[PDB]
Amino acid sequence: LSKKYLAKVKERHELKEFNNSISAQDNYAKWTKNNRKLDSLDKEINNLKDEIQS
Amino acid sequence: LSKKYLAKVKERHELKEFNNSISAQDNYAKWTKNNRKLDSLDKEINNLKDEIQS
Amino acid sequence: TVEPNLHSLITSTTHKWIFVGGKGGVGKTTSSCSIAIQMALSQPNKQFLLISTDPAHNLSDAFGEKFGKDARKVTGMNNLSCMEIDPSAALGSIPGIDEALSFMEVMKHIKRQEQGEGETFDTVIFDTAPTGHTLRFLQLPNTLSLNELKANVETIRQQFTDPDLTTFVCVCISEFLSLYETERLIQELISYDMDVNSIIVNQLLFAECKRCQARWKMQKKYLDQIDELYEDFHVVKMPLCAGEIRGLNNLTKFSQFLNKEYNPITDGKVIYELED
Amino acid sequence: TVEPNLHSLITSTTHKWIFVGGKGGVGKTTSSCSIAIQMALSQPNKQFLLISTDPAHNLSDAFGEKFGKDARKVTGMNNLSCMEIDPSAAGSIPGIDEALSFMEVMKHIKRQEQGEGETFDTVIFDTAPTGHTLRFLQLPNTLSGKLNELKANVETIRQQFTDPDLTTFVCVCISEFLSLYETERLIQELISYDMDVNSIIVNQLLFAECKRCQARWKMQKKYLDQIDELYEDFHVVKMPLCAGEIRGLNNLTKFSQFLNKEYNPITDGKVIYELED
Ligand SMILES: [Zn+2]
């Protein structure tokens, strides 16, 4: 299971760095969807983390 | 002393109603100074109130 | 494709509450008024109440007529009632307290306006404060777990959650800073389980001097982006009439474009009218 | 009548921390940059750092060059360094979150100083679009071995932001009721904190002398008349609306001047057309 967890963080971390490197002002649509998705992964993680907490 | 306290609240209450009845948008300068003053009286009061609390 | 207007809402038969938020100088106060005005022309057999906690009594500035603490009909119409009040005045550093008791007081005070009256309000519109919406109280009971309060909250929360009962209209302009905030808003609103499917974009020039045919550019720029990013929302696009716009006539006159999507090509002559 | 410019500040020789804030679309990011550029040109033997926690990297946008987590120089200058970072990345009481947040920035600013070898004289804070985490300096009051560990630190920052000679806050705003209202709301807050603020920048003015400008102007002028008799004791710099966006060191510099030598349409009208290309 922790093997799925790790799989996710790469995604989150990688997608953050990507969004970090884009003109949020010249690519607004893209920047946001990416942010939404970014937020999405944050929540999928903790659901995981907490399982693992047992 | 409470006789000064009461003296104030009239001021506060009366000034509020006045400000309430003015175009804050068409008399911005006036509206604000009045609001400042309004805020001023709120604080002079509690200094009083708390004395009386004894 | 989702109709680019507010016709669905302006003709609702389930909506008892309609909040209307948006931080910034966003022509929002004119937006709340248009909506209120339009519903009341589309459902006369219904009684609409438009309230403000804005303590500069904007609803008054807008109509150019002086409302107050007791619901009062707009001179010019027989189902639309403005009310301007202030909860703080009428009214433990926990997050949610102030907001709850406040709004709470509002409602208590709306019902007073209904009982002692005799006649009663169908659908009420909230023109959110210039210092933001108090809607954080929606999530009070959660961070909660005295109950006399948590009990009242729930009763309302239940009712603000039902998407047929209540929705929130977002106001905004075609600008990075504004939009950014608007999205941030939508996130929070959903954090709450609050329906939101409408976005009013004000002030667009549609420019077909030389500051206009430049400012238009960015507007049109970000417009394209809104388009790619809220497909599932009705987002009404609104014109910018020169100078201030207030007065039940004018207000009414301009409120139409929340109904039938303002089209510059054709609905053009109506914008010179309001610019005089 | 206090000088309607920022010349006192752009030449100050005591200020270590200059906050710049104001909500709304108020051409503020161009304000943060202008000020920063302007000091850099009036104190070369000094090092300036302009930082932003805006997660949309507005500093890069404004400069049209790509800054980052590590203090770096603006291409075209040698004493002005930009930095873009994100505190949130690196007990629901009021004050905590904001305090640690800022705290961490300070730590991180010093890192950019030691590991480097050269140090920053005066940093300019472009406050976040969600507004200043500045509530945190009233924490001591409204406020467990790790507890004091914080409050103590906080006091050490506060001690410094409290001193009118060391740190002031510039307000950015436009000549519009909603903004203006909000500004004063802000100034009160700032004062509630014993934070110095004696400077207001008013952007986007038309000074008009089509037919939609000469109408929007009336309002602007209208509220101008109000500011004038409501902040006598403030330097309030009034600034022109260049047509369209305005970025790039060159341009940013060319515009930044009107914070120093107050703008003037009758005369200085020639320059504004220069940026309108
Ligand atoms: Zn124009």
Curated annotation (Swiss-Prot), chains A, B:
UniProt KW keywords: Coiled coil, Endoplasmic reticulum, ER-Golgi transport, Golgi apparatus, Membrane, Mitochondrion, Transmembrane, Transmembrane helix, Transport
Which compartments does it reside in?
Endoplasmic reticulum membrane; Golgi apparatus membrane; Mitochondrion membrane
Q: Where do the coiled-coil regions begin and end?
A: 31-54
GO MF terms on file? protein transmembrane transporter activity; protein-membrane adaptor activity
**Disulfide bonds, paired cysteine numbers:** none
A GO-annotated cellular component: mitochondrial membrane
Which Gene Ontology BP annotations are present?
Answer: establishment of protein localization to endoplasmic reticulum membrane; mitophagy; protein insertion into ER membrane; retrograde vesicle-mediated transport, Golgi to endoplasmic reticulum; tail-anchored membrane protein insertion into ER membrane
Q: What is the superkingdom listed in this entry's lineage?
A: Eukaryota
The main location class comes to endoplasmic reticulum
Listed under subunit, the entry gives:
Component of the Golgi to ER traffic (GET) complex, which is composed of GET1, GET2 and GET3. Within the complex, GET1 and GET2 form a heterotetramer which is stabilized by phosphatidylinositol binding and which binds to the GET3 homodimer.
Protein's job = Required for the post-translational delivery of tail-anchored (TA) proteins to the endoplasmic reticulum. Together with GET2, acts as a membrane receptor for soluble GET3, which recognizes and selectively binds the transmembrane domain of TA proteins in the cytosol. The GET complex cooperates with the HDEL receptor ERD2 to mediate the ATP-dependent retrieval of resident ER proteins that contain a C-terminal H-D-E-L retention signal from the Golgi to the ER. Involved in mitochondrial distribution and morphology.
Entry protein name? Golgi to ER traffic protein 1
Q: Native species of this protein?
A: Saccharomyces cerevisiae (strain ATCC 204508 / S288c) (Baker's yeast)
Q: Which residues of the full protein are shown?
A: 38 to 91 of 235
Curated annotation (Swiss-Prot), chain D:
Subcellular locations according to the entry? Cytoplasm; Endoplasmic reticulum; Golgi apparatus
Question: Which Gene Ontology terms of cellular component type are present?
Answer: cytosol; endoplasmic reticulum; endoplasmic reticulum membrane; GET complex; Golgi apparatus
Query: Which EC numbers characterise this protein's activity in its record?
Result: 3.6.-.-
Q: Which domain of life is it from?
A: Eukaryota
Q: Where is the active site?
A: D54
Q: Name one GO molecular function term.
A: ATP hydrolysis activity
Please tell me where Zn(2+) binds in this chain: C210, C213
Q: Can you tell me which residues bind ATP?
A: 23-30, 176, 203, 240-247
One GO biological process term: post-translational protein targeting to endoplasmic reticulum membrane
What Pfam families does this protein map onto? ArsA_ATPase
- InterPro entries, alphabetized: Anion-transp_ATPase-like_dom, ATPase_ArsA/GET3, ATPase_ArsA/GET3_euk, P-loop_NTPase
Which EC class heads this enzyme's classification? Answer: hydrolase
Subunit and partners = Homodimer. Component of the Golgi to ER traffic (GET) complex, which is composed of GET1, GET2 and GET3. Within the complex, GET1 and GET2 form a heterotetramer which is stabilized by phosphatidylinositol binding and which binds to the GET3 homodimer. Interacts with the chloride channel protein GEF1.
> Which family is this protein grouped under?
Belongs to the arsA ATPase family.
List, alphabetically, the HAMAP family matched.
Answer: Asna1_Get3
Q: What is this protein called?
A: ATPase GET3
